Design a protein around this ligand. Structure first.
Ligand code: 3VT
Length: 360
C-alpha cells in the first residue's frame, strides 16, 4: 500500500542517520500534495523514556531566523520600515554610530561589514550591554560587500523591526505572529504547562542541554516548536495566499532573493537553491565554511522571486538540538526534520535529500 512505501522511504532515510549520529529522538513531518504525514522516532528524553511524537517540542535554533524575517516582513507591509532604511533610524541610541551607514537589508542578509557569528562572551542578555556593543562596533569591510553569517546582524534586524512596530520582539511574536500563523505549539518561552512536551537536548557524553539565555536569543535562535507546528509554518510558506493579506505579504517578503554566494541565493531568513541540484552541492551550501567564513556576494540587479523550481531551506542548531526545514514552492512539497542532538548539517541534508528524491 502507499503508506507502507512512504514509511519505507522515510525509515530508510532516517534510521541509518539516527544510528550513525547517535540521535536519541527525531521527528519528521512532510507536506505532500496538500496532505501532512508524520514519522516519529526514538526518545524525547532517554532518562524517563518519553517518546518523540509530532507534538514534542524541539529547539529549532537558527530556523528561528525565518520567523524573525516574517515579523520584519509584517513591519515592511505596514510601512513601519523599509529595507533601505539606515539601521539607526529605528533606535536613537545608535544615532551617530556606524549604524548610520548600514541598511536594514545589510543586517538581515549578514552583509553589514563583519558583525561576528556570535556576540562576544562579554555581552550578556541585558539591554544596556547590547546597546553599548552596537554603539561601539566598527565594520571590518564595506557594508554590502561580504556575507558573514551572524546572530548580532539578523538579531539587530529583528530587534529594529520590533522597535518599528513599537512593541518588544518577543511580545509581537507571541501576541501577533504565532496566532496569525495558527501556531499554538510554538514558543519563545515555553509555558510551564507545556514543559512535559519539551524534549531533552544531548551533547558530548550525553550531557543534557537546553538553550540558556543570551543577547537577542529570541531573534536569532530561540524558538521551540513541534514538528506538526513547524510543518504548519512550512504550509503557510507554500501557500501565503491562504492567510489574511497582511500576513500573506509578510511571508512573501521572505521569498525574495538579494544576492548569490555559490549555489545559494539569500533571502530574508530563507536560503534558496535551484532544484534539482546534487546532494553534494546542497551539503556544501549548508557547510561549516558557509557559517564561519566571509564570502563575497554576487548582488542581483533586482530582488528575485524565490518560487518555482527551487528548494528553500534553513538549518538550525543549539548546543543540544539539530533542525532542518526545506520546501519546494513549485512542487507543493515541504519537509521538517527535528532532532535532539546537534548532528552535522551534512547528515540532516542527507536525510532530506533521500526523502525528497524518493517522493519525486
Ligand atoms: B543557527 O542555529 O545557525 C547556525 C547553526 C546551523 O545549524 O546552521 C548557528 C546558529 C546559532 C548559533 O549561536 C548559538 C546557538 N545556540 C545557542 C547559542 N548561540 C551558532 C553559533 C551557529 C553556528
Amino acid at each position: 500500500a502507499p503508506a507502507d512505501r512512504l514509511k519505507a522511504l522515510v525509515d530508510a532515510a532516517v534510521q541509518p542517520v539516527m544510528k550513525a549520529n547517535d540521535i536519541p529522538g527525531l521527528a519528521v513531518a512532510i507536506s505532500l500534495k496538500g496532505e501532512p504525514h508524520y514519522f516519529s522516532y526514538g526518545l524525547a528524553s532517554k532518562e524517563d523514556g518519553r517518546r518523540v511524537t509530532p507534538e514534542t517540542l524541539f529547539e529549532i535554533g537558527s530556523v528561528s531566523k525565518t520567523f524573525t524575517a516574517t515579523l520584519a516582513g509584517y513591519a515592511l507591509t505596514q510601512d513601519k520600515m523599509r529595507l533601505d532604511d539606515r539601521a539607526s533610524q529605528h533606535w536613537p541610541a545608535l544615532q551617530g554610530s556606524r549604524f548610520d551607514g548600514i541598511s536594514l537589508l545589510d543586517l538581515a542578509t549578514y552583509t553589514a561589514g563583519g558583525l561576528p557569528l556570535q556576540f562576544p562572551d562579554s555581552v550578556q542578555k541585558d539591554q544596556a550591554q547590547i546597546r553599548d556593543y552596537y554603539r561601539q562596533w566598527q565594520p571590518t569591510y564595506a557594508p554590502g560587500s561580504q556575507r558573514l553569517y551572524s546572530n548580532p546582524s539578523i538579531g539587530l534586524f529583528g530587534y529594529l523591526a520590533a522597535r518599528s512596530l513599537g512593541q518588544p520582539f518577543e511580545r509581537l511574536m507571541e501576541q501577533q505572529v504565532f496566532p496569525a500563523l495558527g501556531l499554538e505549539q510554538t514558543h519563545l518561552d515555553v509555558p510551564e504547562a507545556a514543559l512535559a512536551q519539551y524534549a531533552q537536548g544531548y551533547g558530548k557524553d550525553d550531557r543534557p542541554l537546553r538553550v540558556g539565555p543570551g543577547p537577542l536569543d529570541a531573534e536569532g535562535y530561540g524558538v521551540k516548536t513541534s514538528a506538526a507546528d513547524l510543518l504548519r509554518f512550512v504550509d503557510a510558506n507554500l501557500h501565503p495566499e491562504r492567510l489574511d493579506r497582511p500576513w500573506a505579504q509578510a511571508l512573501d517578503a521572505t521569498h525574495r532573493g538579494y544576492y548569490k554566494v555559490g549555489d545559494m541565493t539569500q533571502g530574508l531568513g530563507w536560503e534558496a537553491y535551484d532544484w534539482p541540484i546534487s546532494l553534494k552541492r546542497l551539503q556544501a551550501g549548508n557547510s561549516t565554511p558557509m557559517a564561519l567564513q566571509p564570502h563575497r556576494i554576487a548582488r542581483l540587479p533586482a530582488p528575485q522571486a524565490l518560487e518555482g523550481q527551487r528548494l528553500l531551506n534553513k538549518t538550525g542548531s543549539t548546543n543540544g538540538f539539530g533542525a532542518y526545514v526545506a520546501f519546494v514552492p513549485g512542487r507543493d512539497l515541504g519537509l521538517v526534520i527535528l532532532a535532539n542532538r546537534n548532528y552535522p548539517n551534512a547528515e540532516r541534508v542527507k536525510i532530506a535529500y533521500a526523502i525528497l528524491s524518493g517522493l519525486e
